[PDB]
């Protein structure tokens, strides 16, 4: 599909049994969600943006369904003010910018 | 052009006769550039950042050329990690997300 940018490019994603609304974010290197228990080991990480940094947990090889496309990769979990899909998963579903 | 996301979507812009690199950012409502001096009136503004609100200067109706595509709109100037082109100007240049 083609998603215009008049509005925030928000989509509902699925990880296991869980739905989240998340923003397709070409300005994010990484995918970050709030309020998510995920399976497996995790390591602390700090990620930055406008305003400064937040502390997150890094989980690897996590399946994320995005518009019928199956991504698998790193998901960060922490107090992000918006759930975010970053380039690490956008690339896997074949997402590009076009103008 | 078509810009893939294996690398940061950095492009050259021209603003006030200056060339700068900027990130095409679908996760940003607004365009925020690093500290620089711009034309005329500006309004003190606050934008919601990580950990709270950050002070920026708001300049309205500024011409910005992005990969040779013309936009005229609001540019914020303040402490950003990167020059960021947000949806306010991505829409003007006809930028979409596609997969």
């Amino acid at each position: 599909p083609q998603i215009t940018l008049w509005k925030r490019p928000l989509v509902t994603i699925r990880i296991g049994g869980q739905l989240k609304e998340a923003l397709l974010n070409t300005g994010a290197d990484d995918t970050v969600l709030e309020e998510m228990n995920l399976p497996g080991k995790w390591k602390p990480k700090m990620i930055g943006g406008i305003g400064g940094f937040i502390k997150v947990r890094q989980y690897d090889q996590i399946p994320v369904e995005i518009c019928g496309h199956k991504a698998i990769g790193t998901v960060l979990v922490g107090p992000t003010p918006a759930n975010i899909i970053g380039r690490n998963l956008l690339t896997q579903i074949g997402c590009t910018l076009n103008f | 052009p078509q810009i893939t996301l294996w690398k940061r979507p950095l492009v050259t812009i021209r603003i006030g006769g200056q060339l700068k690199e900027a990130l095409l950012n679908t996760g940003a409502d607004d365009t925020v550039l690093e500290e620089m001096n711009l034309p005329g009136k500006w309004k003190p503004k606050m934008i919601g950042g990580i950990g709270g609100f950050i002070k920026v200067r708001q300049y309205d109706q500024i011409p910005v050329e992005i990969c040779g595509h013309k936009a005229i709109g609001t540019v914020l100037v303040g402490p950003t990690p990167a020059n960021i082109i947000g949806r306010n100007l991505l829409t003007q240049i006809g930028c979409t997300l596609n997969f």
């Binding site: 300005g27 406008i50 | 940003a28």
Partner: peptide, 7 residues
């Protein structure tokens, strides 16, 4: 690393 969300 940079997640440049912006509201």
């Amino acid at each position: 690393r940079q997640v440049n969300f912006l509201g």
